[PDB]
């Protein structure tokens, strides 16, 4: 039952060019504050990543979908907010590795282990540790798993594979970059192997692919991973269609739902950012990309669905949900594929939070693996890197820049950058804290022993 | 007995390798945090402005002087924390201007009032607007303005001048630049003579040169700005020596701190980011400039100082206090002046942070004006823009990057960052926020009628 509040608007409140116009709040905040602080149990937690999704993407995003004295209704909205590091580990030193990537980062809040670049649900002696979804099935609650990338991909991946390398999709690549996690070697197996064993009540995104090859060992060699999926008991579903079927989800009848070969399509079309993009080239506007499809369900959608499903357990649930092609089209310099996968994270987030205010024992947690290279500049910009003008809901143009990378792909910053939460122990994201914290908090709020 | 905490500790707990070694905190946060909140009213207010100070730079400064796993006693202290935006506005247009200046964004929060670039004091329509220092004093309250730069310069100016450009320090700039606001055109004069009009109880800083000047008008046309400050009751001071000495500071006997021609002095030295810097050139060690000189105040100390001359005003006072450098070096791309101006704002945040637990009705708040180009990347990063690798506390090299110009300057960048706060009325930082909501966020806690 309703009663930690959510920000209903943070919005400029009127004519930004007058005095009070651009303000944000309209009162004193610290009653609001002190009913969003509850130390009580978190019966189930939400917890969204928005793959690369550092504070200048969020900006990046309001600016162009919903101004600058926008308001991102579920992104933006949660009350208790900080910023958290997500450095990593070399390997072999053990010292810091200032830039992470997103395996060692989601190894990170999910088993609250620092780890090297590349590695997933193991440190950095390879030793295997426990993950928050493991952890909670164990304890008896419902879990889900819900991505917009394949789910062989390291966020998804980080909370049901231990392996060596990121790369390990499945039983080939696992043969020949991950021998001591190849199953006809007495390893776990491959990470989509791993995924069909974790078991988790609902996993939801793409990667249909993998699925595609045959196990090298084990009581379902010769078969495809697919096929392995039928025979262990699993529900498949490969459409909005099928997905909105599904009643029930279980130990039973786990769901596993592949709605693409790979990462799922993406919200927006447009041009690459290119070398003095904003002075060369005009203004371009995203344009809503037809791939997208009604028989493809959406990221708020998988929520509804997973969060549907998941609450049949008295007990309680943990879910994750990530918008994954955020960090991708950040790395395509590609504006409005990136702006586009932040506005589908909020609806997402969005369907989190309205859930979570009316169920009243549910935190839900708002943060990104690690920042990213687009960067908001001057109109007048001219880098060395790839930029790009946009058309902005307020009608005046923005600029974005790519310049960290002369290579193809643009890459990670080690910039911290923002952790929101709302509900029980969202206190524990507030102020400056680690991304390792984030597991201990969820641990916590959880009561998992 | 301090009922409002300041976190002593969220260094990393242990050993990084470790489960549970890198996590900042040691247990639930509810309670502490519900120990921060109070409405009652601020008697005073330090504000300290780390110019150009993004999350970025708070990392990678955390990251060379303290380590990864650090911890800055200062900035990182304050325990509610959020994340305002600080667009400005475009002049003809009155749209959103994603990426501000330093005039224009310090004009938001000491006025209230989005503005365009380059205006200090004034709207889109060059119309005056009380500064929070204007009306602290108007109040009965005493008023500090502390800067590392040339008070002058856009964020101490702010303070106490209203003029259409931020160009016009003197007389003859003002002449050419602002005629609207020449004293011999009937306007209130150049950001100087404004300045001296002001007359807040406490101006330290750089910029003497500015003060060489002779007023073409006014009661004062002929002599020198540093005549007319003498001439007016004005107590100048121009090393730490003298500083040291003065026992008082009121409207009587107002002090002026003239400590530097131009900007003073940089804490540190090092090369500047070059291409392929990283790869080409030897990782760096910072070096202590030897000419930061002993006679010449430290922000540390000018804040120290300020507070002294300040708080034997039973009213309460308001001190804006600014480490202005930070911002420059990243407009230098020198990794090692930026880093060292902020680990130079942090001991100056130390010391407003130690007066204010003590005093029990201080208001902290800790932030920054817009965000800058600087960022951290990967150690084998091969960047189109300028970048360096440097020898951190950890003992292990960190690559910075500077590449969102071709230009001899680098950048600022639009995206939302930081704020902090700690005191009276503190729980109005968190969330999302915008600048201009400081301005009432500082006026209300001050309960300024
Ligand atoms: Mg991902
Ligand atoms: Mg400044
Ligand atoms: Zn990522
Ligand atoms: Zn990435
Ligand atoms: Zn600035
Ligand atoms: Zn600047």
């Not at 920000?7 to 009653?31: C, F, K, M, S, W």
């Not at 690369?52 to 990046?60: F, K, L, P, R, Y």
């Not at 193991?122 to 789910?151: C, F, Q, R, W, Y």
């Not at 039983?171 to 199953?183: I, Q, R």
Request: with cysteine; hydrophobic share 35%.
């Amino acid at each position: 039952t309703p009663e930690m509040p959510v920000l209903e608007n943070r919005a400029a409140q009127g004519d930004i060019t007058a005095p009070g116009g651009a303000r944000r709040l309209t009162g004193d905040q610290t009653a609001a504050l002190r009913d969003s602080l509850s130390d009580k149990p978190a019966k189930n937690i939400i917890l969204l990543i928005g793959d690369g999704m550092g504070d200048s993407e969020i900006t990046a995003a309001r600016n162009y979908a919903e101004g600058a004295g926008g308001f991102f209704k579920g992104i933006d909205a949660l009350p208790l907010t900080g910023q958290y590091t997500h450095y990593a580990l070399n390997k072999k030193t053990g010292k810091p590795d200032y830039v992470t990537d997103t395996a060692a980062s989601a190894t990170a809040w999910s088993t609250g282990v620092k780890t090297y670049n590349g590695a997933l649900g193991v440190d950095i002696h390879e030793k295997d540790h426990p993950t928050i979804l493991e952890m909670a099935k164990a304890a008896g609650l419902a879990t889900g798993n819900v991505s917009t990338a394949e789910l062989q991909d390291a966020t998804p991946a980080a909370l049901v594979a231990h392996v060596t390398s990121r790369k390990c999709y499945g039983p080939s690549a696992t043969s020949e970059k991950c021998p001591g996690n190849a199953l006809e070697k007495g390893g776990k197996g491959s990470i989509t192997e791993q995924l069909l064993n974790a078991r988790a009540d609902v996993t939801l995104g793409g990667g249909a692919k993998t699925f595609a090859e045959t196990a090298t060992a084990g009581e379902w060699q010769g078969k495809t991973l697919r096929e392995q999926a039928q025979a262990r008991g699993y529900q498949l579903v490969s459409d909005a269609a099928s997905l909105n079927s599904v009643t029930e989800a279980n130990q039973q009848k786990p769901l596993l739902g592949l709605f693409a070969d790979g990462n799922m399509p993406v919200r927006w079309l447009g041009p690459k950012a290119t070398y003095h993009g904003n002075i060369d080239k005009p203004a371009v506007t995203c344009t809503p990309n037809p791939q997208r499809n009604d028989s493809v369900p959406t990221l708020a959608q998988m929520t509804d669905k997973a969060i549907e499903l998941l609450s049949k357990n008295e007990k309680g649930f943990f879910l994750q949900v990530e918008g994954a092609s955020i960090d991708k089209q950040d790395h395509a310099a590609n504006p409005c594929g990136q702006i586009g996968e932040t506005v589908d994270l909020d609806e997402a987030v969005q369907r989190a939070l309205e859930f979570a205010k009316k169920e009243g024992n549910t935190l839900v947690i708002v943060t990104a693996d690690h920042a990213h290279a687009s960067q908001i500049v001057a109109p007048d910009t001219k880098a060395p890197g790839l930029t790009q003008a946009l058309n902005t809901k307020d009608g005046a143009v923005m600029v974005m820049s790519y310049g960290n990378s002369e290579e193809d792909s643009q890459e990670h910053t080690g910039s911290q950058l923002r952790i929101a939460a709302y509900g029980p122990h969202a206190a524990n994201v507030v102020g400056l804290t680690d991304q390792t914290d984030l597991f201990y908090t969820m641990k916590a709020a959880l009561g998992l022993k």
